[PDB]
Design an enzyme around this catalytic site. Structure first.
Site: not given
Ligand code: FR4
Ligand code: ZN
Length: 349
Positions: A12, A14, A16, A181, A211, A214, A235, A292-293
């Site tokens: 798990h 990403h 990007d 997302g 996903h 979370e 998650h 994750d990231d």
């Molecule tokens: N950890 C991640 O969620 C994530 C998603 N990406 C991309 C795909 O690999 C896409 C990035 N992206 C584009 C629109 C979008 C909308 C929501 C999210 N992620 C979340 O909503 C995760 C929950 C969250 C809530 C509040 C704060 C941080 C994270 C990523 C999004 C990279 N990392």
């Molecule tokens: Zn993720």
């Protein structure tokens, strides 16, 4: 230093969210974009969080750097390449990496993400470029890599393209479909574009992760399981909220992709509480440990292992069964999965 000094599996992460600062600057300059910095170190400081943030706060992190990579072909191949390098430093022998192809593209995609002028990079060759970078990395760094392609919650129209890309590029390197997302948008698991994408994935044998759980309720987990037919949860923390669901997932041996460090930084877990993973440890759940990231959370896999060893009393034995659980729950064919198992049994003894 490292909490766990044996080879590791990771399911798990990403793509990007796992770019080196240095190469964003490189492409910032060389394309025109120009970041809110021009040194690697300060770049990581603003494009990298260290205490929890809201979602818009979070997304603007991407708004910084993504215009520097998206669109450029040699950028897309290089980040896939350097992702394997980064992972070899973590001691990972097997990794699945996920991304959204559409988000790296600047043509054949409505809307065009990242504001971004048009151009000629379509989703389809984004995945070929990524999976070239990845195959080279595998060869040079001796980490085995496969990839997952993300659907996006807000954009159910991309989703039939994603399943079709999974089929076109199967084995090599892509093994699965994901859904990513913002699991908070109402009804999003059940948007027709997504459900029929996942139903295509059942029909043609593409593996499935979602996903769910979370930042959302146990209900969105339930939809991932019952309607989207996941094999795994990314998650899945909130399944605890619903005890019958939890118990059911325990019996079916569902695999949770746990991301400890992330969950603090996202708000999904509040520090003054039960961490869901310790419960999973006590319950002998099928779960994994994942980064994750690493870009945005200023982190490596050892951040996650460290946190669970310091603050959650995780031991070496649990580390072993977790990475074994992750190898069993991988989306490798079964012969290659037995090979990985064997490597790990030997390494671990
Ligand atoms: N950890 C991640 O969620 C994530 C998603 N990406 C991309 C795909 O690999 C896409 C990035 N992206 C584009 C629109 C979008 C909308 C929501 C999210 N992620 C979340 O909503 C995760 C929950 C969250 C809530 C509040 C704060 C941080 C994270 C990523 C999004 C990279 N990392
Ligand atoms: Zn993720």
């Amino acid at each position: 230093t490292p909490a766990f000094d044996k080879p590791k599996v990771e399911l798990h992460v990403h793509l990007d969210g796992a770019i080196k600062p240095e190469t964003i600057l490189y492409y910032g300059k060389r394309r025109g974009i120009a970041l809110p910095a021009d040194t690697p170190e300060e770049l990581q400081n603003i494009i990298g969080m260290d205490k929890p943030l809201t979602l818009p706060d979070f997304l603007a992190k991407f708004d910084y750097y993504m215009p520097a990579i998206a669109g450029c072909r040699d950028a897309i191949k290089r980040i896939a390449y350097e992702f394997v390098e980064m992972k070899a430093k973590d001691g990972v022998v097997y990794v699945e990496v996920r991304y959204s192809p559409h988000l790296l593209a600047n043509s054949k995609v409505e809307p065009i993400p990242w504001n971004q002028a048009e151009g000629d990079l379509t989703p389809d060759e984004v995945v070929s470029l990524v999976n070239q970078g990845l195959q080279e990395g595998e060869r040079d760094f001796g980490v085995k890599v496969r990839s997952i392609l993300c659907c996006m919650r807000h954009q159910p129209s991309w989703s039939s393209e994603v399943v079709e890309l999974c089929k076109k590029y199967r084995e090599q390197t892509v093994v699965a479909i994901d859904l990513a997302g913002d699991e908070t948008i109402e009804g999003s698991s059940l948007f027709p574009g997504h459900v029929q994408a996942y139903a295509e994935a059942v029909k043609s044998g593409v593996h499935r992760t979602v996903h769910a759980g979370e930042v959302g309720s146990a209900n969105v987990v339930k939809e991932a399981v019952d309607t989207l037919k996941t094999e795994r949860l990314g998650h899945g923390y909130h399944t605890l909220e619903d005890t019958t669901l939890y118990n059911r997932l325990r019996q079916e041996n569902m695999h949770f992709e746990i991301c400890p460090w992330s969950s603090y930084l996202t708000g999904a877990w509040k520090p003054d509480t039960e961490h869901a993973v310790i419960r999973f440890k006590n319950d002998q759940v099928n779960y994994s440990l994942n980064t994750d990231d690493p870009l945005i959370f200023k982190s490596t896999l050892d951040t996650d292992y460290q946190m669970t060893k310091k603050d959650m009393g995780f031991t070496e034995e649990e580390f072993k069964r977790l990475n074994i659980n992750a190898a069993k729950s991988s989306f490798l064919p079964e012969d290659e999965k037995k090979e990985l198992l064997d490597l790990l049994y030997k390494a671990y003894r």
